[PDB]
Chains A and B, each alone.
Chain A
Amino acid sequence: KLSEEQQHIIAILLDAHHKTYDPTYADFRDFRPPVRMSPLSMLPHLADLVSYSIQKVIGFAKMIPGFRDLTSDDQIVLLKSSAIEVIMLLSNQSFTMDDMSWDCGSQDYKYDVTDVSKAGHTLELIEPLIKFQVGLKKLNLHEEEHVLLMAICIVSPDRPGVQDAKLVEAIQDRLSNTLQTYIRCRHPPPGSHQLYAKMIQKLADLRSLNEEHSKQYRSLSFQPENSMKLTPLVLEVFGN
């Protein structure tokens, strides 16, 4: 019941993922070094991590079937708004339920609540972010469902500033139907129970996290000396 096109779409998204996500995290050594102590000591390191991840999110989006057909301005709008959400999704791969932290290959590059707090964020974001990572982890998505969820997150028509919303929605619909059919044919029970609905709920959760993140980003970036620690791409994307 999974058509040839839908098996094609999945193969593409999986490939795009493999070419844009490095599970060895080798490049992290290029970042400004993580400093754990106290005042914003993790901002330069995590800011570089984010900036790096935006580049990977961009590379992924471009390989989403139909994404290229959008106008450059719609592409910009979709990436600007979803980037932090897709990074949070991407990060679930490094997130371990063992100690509720993001474990990226080593101890220096192991990130926990106190590391995120030392990036300038409060529990008002961090609590639901971990809550999100745990609940997403519990879903035990196939990698196919993971990459589909990320594509669907990027191509949302209700994003602020979207012009050709009809065209965006058509692209997303084709992806949603690909996901829904995949779960029915490829994801066995009980793991497939209400799985689509739960995955959609996660997209709602990400909107909320995106909103809280923006508020706290405006606070942090409001101060030039902290804004000074970010990267040009992070300012361009998370900025106005």
Chain B
Amino acid sequence: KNHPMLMNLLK
């Protein structure tokens, strides 16, 4: 939830 960079690194 509002973690662009964390989610981008997760994908």
Contact = CB atoms under 8 A, between A and B. Distances in A.
Interface stretch (A41-49, A74-82, A87-95, A137-145): A74-82
A75 B5 CA distance: 13
Looking at chain B's contact residues, is the secondary structure mostly helix, strand, loop, or mixed?
Answer: helix
A73 B11 CA distance: 12
A236 B10 contact: no
* Chain B interface category by residue count: under 10
A79 B4 CA distance: 14
A55 interface: yes
A204 interface: no
Contact of A62 (B1, B4, B7, B10): B10
B6 A236 contact: yes
A142 B10 CA distance: 28
Interface string A186-230: 000000000000000000000000000000000000000000000
A80 B9 contact: no
A76 B9 contact: no
A237 B6 contact: yes
Contacts of B7: 72, 76
21 contacts: A55-B9, A58-B6, A58-B9, A59-B9, A62-B10, A72-B7, A72-B10, A72-B11, A73-B1, A75-B10, A76-B3, A76-B6, A76-B7, A79-B6, A80-B6, A233-B6, A236-B3, A236-B4, A236-B6, A237-B3, A237-B6
